[PDB]
Scaffold this active site. Sequence first.
Site, PDB file in Angstrom:
ATOM      1  N   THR A   1      49.255  48.616  45.905  1.00 42.75           N
ATOM      2  CA  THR A   1      49.391  47.238  45.467  1.00 42.75           C
ATOM      3  C   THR A   1      50.800  47.018  44.928  1.00 42.75           C
ATOM      4  O   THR A   1      51.224  47.694  43.987  1.00 42.75           O
ATOM      5  CB  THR A   1      48.362  46.890  44.398  1.00 42.75           C
TER       6      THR A   1
ATOM      7  N   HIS B   1      47.306  37.891  46.300  1.00 45.75           N
ATOM      8  CA  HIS B   1      46.427  38.509  45.323  1.00 45.75           C
ATOM      9  C   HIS B   1      45.302  37.550  44.934  1.00 45.75           C
ATOM     10  O   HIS B   1      44.889  37.499  43.777  1.00 45.75           O
ATOM     11  CB  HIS B   1      47.216  38.958  44.089  1.00 45.75           C
TER      12      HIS B   1
ATOM     13  N   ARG C   1      36.141  38.283  46.767  1.00 45.72           N
ATOM     14  CA  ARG C   1      35.112  37.680  45.928  1.00 45.72           C
ATOM     15  C   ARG C   1      33.756  37.583  46.608  1.00 45.72           C
ATOM     16  O   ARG C   1      32.751  37.900  45.952  1.00 45.72           O
ATOM     17  CB  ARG C   1      35.578  36.302  45.446  1.00 45.72           C
TER      18      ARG C   1
ATOM     19  N   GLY D   1      40.701  33.897  50.450  1.00 48.36           N
ATOM     20  CA  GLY D   1      39.863  32.786  50.847  1.00 48.36           C
ATOM     21  C   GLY D   1      39.088  32.952  52.134  1.00 48.36           C
ATOM     22  O   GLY D   1      38.570  31.954  52.656  1.00 48.36           O
ATOM     23  N   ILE D   2      39.010  34.161  52.683  1.00 49.99           N
ATOM     24  CA  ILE D   2      38.194  34.367  53.872  1.00 49.99           C
ATOM     25  C   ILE D   2      36.733  34.187  53.477  1.00 49.99           C
ATOM     26  O   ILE D   2      36.194  34.968  52.686  1.00 49.99           O
ATOM     27  CB  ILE D   2      38.431  35.751  54.475  1.00 49.99           C
ATOM     28  N   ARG D   3      36.080  33.168  54.045  1.00 52.37           N
ATOM     29  CA  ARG D   3      34.730  32.801  53.625  1.00 52.37           C
ATOM     30  C   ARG D   3      33.732  32.738  54.776  1.00 52.37           C
ATOM     31  O   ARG D   3      32.578  32.353  54.552  1.00 52.37           O
ATOM     32  CB  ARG D   3      34.741  31.452  52.880  1.00 52.37           C
TER      33      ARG D   3
ATOM     34  N   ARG E   1      45.828  35.208  41.934  1.00 49.42           N
ATOM     35  CA  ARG E   1      45.661  35.816  40.623  1.00 49.42           C
ATOM     36  C   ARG E   1      46.964  36.322  40.024  1.00 49.42           C
ATOM     37  O   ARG E   1      46.977  36.730  38.855  1.00 49.42           O
ATOM     38  CB  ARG E   1      44.657  36.975  40.723  1.00 49.42           C
TER      39      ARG E   1
HETATM   40  C1  F7F Z   1      38.734  38.716  42.411  1.00 49.84           C
HETATM   41  C2  F7F Z   1      39.463  39.991  42.074  1.00 49.84           C
HETATM   42  C3  F7F Z   1      40.472  40.391  42.894  1.00 49.84           C
HETATM   43  C4  F7F Z   1      41.224  41.550  42.654  1.00 49.84           C
HETATM   44  C5  F7F Z   1      40.868  42.280  41.611  1.00 49.84           C
HETATM   45  C6  F7F Z   1      39.859  41.877  40.726  1.00 49.84           C
HETATM   46  C7  F7F Z   1      39.146  40.723  40.980  1.00 49.84           C
HETATM   47  C8  F7F Z   1      38.019  40.306  40.037  1.00 49.84           C
HETATM   48  N1  F7F Z   1      41.603  43.500  41.314  1.00 49.84           N
HETATM   49  O1  F7F Z   1      43.032  43.427  41.206  1.00 49.84           O
HETATM   50  C9  F7F Z   1      42.424  44.053  42.372  1.00 49.84           C
HETATM   51  C10 F7F Z   1      42.923  45.344  42.267  1.00 49.84           C
HETATM   52  O2  F7F Z   1      42.510  46.066  41.387  1.00 49.84           O
HETATM   53  N2  F7F Z   1      43.940  45.774  43.159  1.00 49.84           N
HETATM   54  C11 F7F Z   1      44.435  44.856  44.218  1.00 49.84           C
HETATM   55  O3  F7F Z   1      45.299  45.254  44.946  1.00 49.84           O
HETATM   56  N3  F7F Z   1      43.848  43.520  44.351  1.00 49.84           N
HETATM   57  C12 F7F Z   1      42.827  43.130  43.470  1.00 49.84           C
HETATM   58  N4  F7F Z   1      42.195  41.901  43.501  1.00 49.84           N
HETATM   59  C13 F7F Z   1      42.574  40.924  44.474  1.00 49.84           C
HETATM   60  C14 F7F Z   1      42.619  41.365  45.889  1.00 49.84           C
HETATM   61  O4  F7F Z   1      41.913  42.439  46.341  1.00 49.84           O
HETATM   62  C15 F7F Z   1      42.689  40.072  46.721  1.00 49.84           C
HETATM   63  O5  F7F Z   1      43.567  40.360  47.678  1.00 49.84           O
HETATM   64  C16 F7F Z   1      41.352  39.452  47.052  1.00 49.84           C
HETATM   65  O6  F7F Z   1      40.837  38.866  45.912  1.00 49.84           O
HETATM   66  C17 F7F Z   1      41.356  38.503  48.269  1.00 49.84           C
HETATM   67  O7  F7F Z   1      40.935  37.230  48.032  1.00 49.84           O
HETATM   68  P1  F7F Z   1      39.481  36.750  48.085  1.00 49.84           P
HETATM   69  O8  F7F Z   1      38.721  37.194  49.232  1.00 49.84           O
HETATM   70  O9  F7F Z   1      39.546  35.340  48.114  1.00 49.84           O
HETATM   71  O10 F7F Z   1      38.775  37.199  46.909  1.00 49.84           O
HETATM   72  O1  F7C Z   2      44.803  39.594  38.421  1.00 44.84           O
HETATM   73  C1  F7C Z   2      43.792  39.903  39.161  1.00 44.84           C
HETATM   74  O2  F7C Z   2      43.000  39.050  39.695  1.00 44.84           O
HETATM   75  C2  F7C Z   2      43.454  41.356  39.412  1.00 44.84           C
HETATM   76  O3  F7C Z   2      43.923  41.919  40.348  1.00 44.84           O
HETATM   77  C3  F7C Z   2      42.472  42.128  38.530  1.00 44.84           C
HETATM   78  O4  F7C Z   2      42.341  41.528  37.283  1.00 44.84           O
HETATM   79  C4  F7C Z   2      42.915  43.557  38.334  1.00 44.84           C
HETATM   80  O5  F7C Z   2      43.401  44.146  39.280  1.00 44.84           O
HETATM   81  O6  F7C Z   2      42.784  44.180  37.246  1.00 44.84           O
END
Ligand code: F7F
Ligand code: F7C
EC number: 1.1.3.46
Lengths: 330, 330, 330, 330
Positions: free
Chosen positions: A150, A226, A281, A259-261, A229
């Site tokens: 990451t 991310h 998610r 956002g892939i849903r 986030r």
């Molecule tokens: C929601 C959430 C996400 C992440 C985390 C926690 C939470 C509670 N933790 O932070 C990770 C981590 O530990 N390492 C990392 O590389 N990415 C993380 N992600 C984000 C990541 O994998 C995204 O690329 C993903 O959410 C795609 O989007 P989505 O399909 O719309 O959800």
């Molecule tokens: O900021 C984020 O959404 C994250 O990736 C998680 O909080 C994390 O990786 O700890």
Amino acid sequence: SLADLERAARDVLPGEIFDFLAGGSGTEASLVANRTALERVFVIPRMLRDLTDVTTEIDIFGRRAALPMAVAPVAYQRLFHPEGELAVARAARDAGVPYTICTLSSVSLEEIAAVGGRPWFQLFWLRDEKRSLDLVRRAEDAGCEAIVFTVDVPWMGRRLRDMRNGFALPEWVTAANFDFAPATWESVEAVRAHTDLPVVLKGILAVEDARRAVDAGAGGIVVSNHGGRQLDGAVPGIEMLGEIVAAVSGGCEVLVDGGIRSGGDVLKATALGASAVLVGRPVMWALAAAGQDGVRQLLELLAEEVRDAMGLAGCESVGAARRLNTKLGV
Amino acid sequence: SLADLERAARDVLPGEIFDFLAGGSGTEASLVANRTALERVFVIPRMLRDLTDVTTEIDIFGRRAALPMAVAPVAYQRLFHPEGELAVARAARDAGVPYTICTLSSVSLEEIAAVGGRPWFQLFWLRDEKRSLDLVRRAEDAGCEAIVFTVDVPWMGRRLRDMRNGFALPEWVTAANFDFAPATWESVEAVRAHTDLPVVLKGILAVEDARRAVDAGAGGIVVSNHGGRQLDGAVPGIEMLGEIVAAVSGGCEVLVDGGIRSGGDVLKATALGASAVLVGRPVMWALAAAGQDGVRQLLELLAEEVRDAMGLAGCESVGAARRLNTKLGV
Amino acid sequence: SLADLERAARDVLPGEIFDFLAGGSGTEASLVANRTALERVFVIPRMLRDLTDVTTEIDIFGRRAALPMAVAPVAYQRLFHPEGELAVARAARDAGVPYTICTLSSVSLEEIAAVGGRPWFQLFWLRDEKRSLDLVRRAEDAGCEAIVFTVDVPWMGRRLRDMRNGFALPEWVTAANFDFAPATWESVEAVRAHTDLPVVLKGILAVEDARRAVDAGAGGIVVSNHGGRQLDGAVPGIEMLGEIVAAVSGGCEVLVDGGIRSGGDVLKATALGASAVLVGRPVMWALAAAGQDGVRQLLELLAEEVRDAMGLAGCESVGAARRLNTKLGV
Amino acid sequence: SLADLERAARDVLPGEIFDFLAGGSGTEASLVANRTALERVFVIPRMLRDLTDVTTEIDIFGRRAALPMAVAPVAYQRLFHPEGELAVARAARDAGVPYTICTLSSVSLEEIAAVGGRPWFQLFWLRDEKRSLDLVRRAEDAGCEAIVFTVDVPWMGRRLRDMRNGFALPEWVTAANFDFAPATWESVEAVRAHTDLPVVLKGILAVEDARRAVDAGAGGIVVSNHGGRQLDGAVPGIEMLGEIVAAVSGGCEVLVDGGIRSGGDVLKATALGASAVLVGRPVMWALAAAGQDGVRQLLELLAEEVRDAMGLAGCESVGAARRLNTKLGV
Ligand SMILES: Cc1cc2c(cc1C)N1O[C@@]13C(=O)NC(=O)N=C3N2C[C@@H](O)[C@@H](O)[C@@H](O)COP(=O)(O)O
Ligand SMILES: *O/C(=O\*)C(=O)[C]([O])C([O])=O
Ligand SMILES: Cc1cc2c(cc1C)N1O[C@@]13C(=O)NC(=O)N=C3N2C[C@@H](O)[C@@H](O)[C@@H](O)COP(=O)(O)O
Ligand SMILES: Cc1cc2c(cc1C)N1O[C@@]13C(=O)NC(=O)N=C3N2C[C@@H](O)[C@@H](O)[C@@H](O)COP(=O)(O)O
Ligand SMILES: Cc1cc2c(cc1C)N1O[C@@]13C(=O)NC(=O)N=C3N2C[C@@H](O)[C@@H](O)[C@@H](O)COP(=O)(O)O
Ligand SMILES: *O/C(=O\*)C(=O)[C]([O])C([O])=O
Ligand SMILES: *O/C(=O\*)C(=O)[C]([O])C([O])=O
Ligand SMILES: *O/C(=O\*)C(=O)[C]([O])C([O])=O
């Protein structure tokens, strides 16, 4: 998916855990933009091609996957269900989908990897380079097939939901791999030299960073903000994907997430040139429903939606889906 | 049209039949996009031209039609009124508008064709090529003037309204032509060689598919995402029409459908280059109102709106309307 | 303006007369688009120029006007106030603004013209060419300074508000000039040869029609979709104005109307290249407030808003305002 | 920021003072457009760069500032808190942020400047050129470091909120620098020749005005539509910034203001090429909260958000942030 899934998770989870899951940084401009970007994409389907052997399989990092998709790294999955990462990893294995073990998993990476399947390992760079590379070694010793480094978290973005919730890791949720520092290109080189596993840089948004990732020996990148986030106002990966795919010119795998849903969203990502998507998610929503079975149902439904979308678009293979044209709407 | 019509149908029909009629696939992104695409189109009208003999007639497939319009194939019309296809076909004949008999008509195609008028026949490819071509032969023997080969249904799209409704064909509604398989270009050739009738490929969205359709000997295409009922996220036909018209360069008739709700929409389609439109759901709304008279009122009102729009735009003929310029709004 | 004005008219007028005034044709797509088009336009103001003698005056058709604006032709003004056209014409004269007498005025054109000021005459072409040209002669004999030949009404657009209201001209409102047929370019020539007054073609939207208007000897055009009252889906005049101004290359006056609601809107129109605007519905709103004084207040407020906007934009003259650049928003 | 701040000010302030603060001119089209323009901007962040010494400092007009930001000139700050300008100036000094003393300050400019820090002085041109230049001399004698010559107020825009509120300066709020006329380029020259301080033209929106500002010897410009308070329909500064930065080609400092509400917005402005932003209304919201401490909290939070955004974007320095690319959304 089927909103009920998200809603079903709305009810079972504490409001502040659902917020940890659903939220983004700042005003959540990049969180919402990931969805707006996918909804703007229209596919131009092809007709009348042979569909006798429609297959959603891909080869990635030397191994077959059932779908152009892997489970995104999401930390502390026991926040969402008592079986946490083990539930998700079992269902992923059974669905033929790679599963990304987190550095911050609430079950040790050796245990998740023993589940089998196609485990990848997501790495956060630690302040101590030797701790970082020992984590990489553990993952490799444990049979992980790829290091998902990451690269968009020099530090964590400011999550206003978590700040307003005064949210903190409940006592019963631990970082099982332990008993952090900004990564640089030098860190990437240190990992690359430490392992024969493909290194996948997660969180690339700039074209020149994608190019440099290939120059640096990455086996793949994840084009990603991310999940909205990290930097609030970061462009969605989906909006950079086509440009990045062209600049990489086949030099590494190019994944996208955010956002892939649905299977239709998978098709859109692949038509923009992605090798595969990550889904974050939604897998955790399902996880409040029956691990080896709630996640398994999500993956089966996603698998069916991908197959449906591909055939309606005239694509017998994921490769054919990558050659589809798209048109941007408003 | 006049919403009341749709509303009037809202009330008389069972909620789950109205849903069968109104719905699309997936999130209905392509269903809504058909309307957004027409609403974005503005016509640049011409002034001060001779309107002494404004005519909405066109020649298509060797025969005159009163309007640049035909009734779209919509299956199981007895779902909407007890006279079903016979009511619609009678009103179409009287209005001088072609009527497309469905493969899945709830009255036999021989019976609908006996009504007279300008019947076309829509073909679904059957798993048995000989059943398919015998259907084509029946249609031709019965005096149908064109085979509308539906090419965007290798299988039916996933209709979430129908899945949530647990909807199924009521017992009293039958597939009267019977007492399916993906079509390919080889199927198109088999039909073309089996009949002297013009073959019209319905469901073309890609420019190269339109070109190939002309190469394959099609007499026409319908630029169409199947009313948003097939691939969810498929581009609207209206958004591909101008490009497709240019690529075909007069090599076949180019029809369009999807969201045509007024004579002004017909004008927009023709200004984008369409030969004619198909109208689907609105004809079925009217069908809950008096067959040979409820549909007839719709067609008369549409006929008047087309004539009005053409004259206000300075077009004495449909050909003049095709030479109008357009400007896309937001 | 000041909504209250429109609202104030909302209350005093019968709902079906306010509808006659406010409505457009079809779904009112072109009515709403006139406003959306102006709201999309942003002006790039200039700073630090000499404003010691800011003047809003223009010369048009050989005479000075106080503002780059005239009252649009609106029929049957006694529908809105008992003094009708006489009230409006008096206030226009006092404000130094031209007033367009309608063919369908509810007070004879000789009477309105006796008010003085700068009367123009709007012509509908009559089925009898000799009636048409006698109307033109009357207007000229009466001292009208320009013939505003309406060219976008071969027949009246379909007003769904008026159809739903079953609205009809109350008994006490007459067409005072009497005690219709589509115009063509031949009609334009007949008028041009019949009068030395400048002929202004109202309702031009196509660039080639604007060019042809200059070729035909028009002294001006009004770039206009008739307030969204004629072809529904006709492009807004404001969206064609810049192109038309460039194509005319100074060959005639280019007016625009449709949705002008403020001095800032006047500035936008002039920055897009218009010589002057017409204002329609707002003048009639004011007319429910005190003729020689309610309309006069509107014109004074518009006059002040134009002066304010011009100075803030760094324009000492209307000519300077035409050289302002604009940027289109979303 | 944190809406509560604005809301907190919503409650404590009289409705008509909050309106004086929040409102714009005309329909407030330019007020809203400033926000829409920032929200459309997405940043393309860079990854994996050295962040060991992330610094938000800049050099501007010969002196270091802690952030790429200064407090915008806002008149009559005692309207918002009894300590007014002294509270804001103290917090600005302590935060290392320049503070712009207004010509219409409710505390004398000598007093505000005695607070220390980095005071700039905003000049309104007075009808008497000698009064204007004596104000400039006072500011310079008092140790102000820059003259911010406001050039977009030949007169004040029409504020409909203030007109509807019948709002007027309460008796206890005075123009402490006193015990006006349109500026021109000649006025700019008079100021430039009267002082060795950098002259900063505030309210430039046209590219050629920016170029001319450099030709005229300005040390900087503020690309600004005056917070939507002057010409209604004036383009947002943010929409002109990139073009203006390119045309100036480093010839003066280019600041921007209008709708800056977060550190992410600061990053966006700097990625578009701005040297620094001004922040207006948010500083006054905080001012209803504890001068040397409510404003100080705003500035600390903004300082942290800027640092966060820069690092997440891979920028060790403001200069690096200016080299970020952006992508415009919808
Ligand atoms: C929601 C959430 C996400 C992440 C985390 C926690 C939470 C509670 N933790 O932070 C990770 C981590 O530990 N390492 C990392 O590389 N990415 C993380 N992600 C984000 C990541 O994998 C995204 O690329 C993903 O959410 C795609 O989007 P989505 O399909 O719309 O959800
Ligand atoms: O900021 C984020 O959404 C994250 O990736 C998680 O909080 C994390 O990786 O700890
Ligand atoms: C609504 C509906 C449509 C169809 C069907 C049923 C229903 C209940 N059945 O599936 C047909 C069929 O049997 N064959 C085929 O080719 N097309 C079909 N269509 C769709 C088709 O004709 C469209 O092109 C049309 O809907 C245009 O859009 P509209 O005017 O907005 O309605
Ligand atoms: C509202 C209204 C308009 C007209 C009429 C009646 C009514 C009740 N009658 O039909 C005229 C006529 O008699 N002749 C003609 O040329 N134009 C007419 N118009 C329209 C015309 O002048 C427009 O250009 C104007 O509305 C600009 O837009 P606005 O400022 O937004 O209102
Ligand atoms: C809100 C407000 C603004 C101003 C004033 C008063 C009030 C109550 N008075 O008029 C000043 C002045 O005296 N001199 C001047 O040059 N500019 C002024 N401005 C505006 C100016 O500084 C803007 O550039 C700023 O608002 C940026 O936008 P924001 O961050 O969104 O607020
Ligand atoms: O999917 C659709 O909307 C259809 O075309 C009908 O259901 C059909 O043809 O059976
Ligand atoms: O259609 C319209 O809005 C009109 O112009 C008036 O009704 C008219 O001219 O009679
Ligand atoms: O118009 C504005 O918002 C202002 O700048 C202030 O009212 C001022 O400067 O007096």
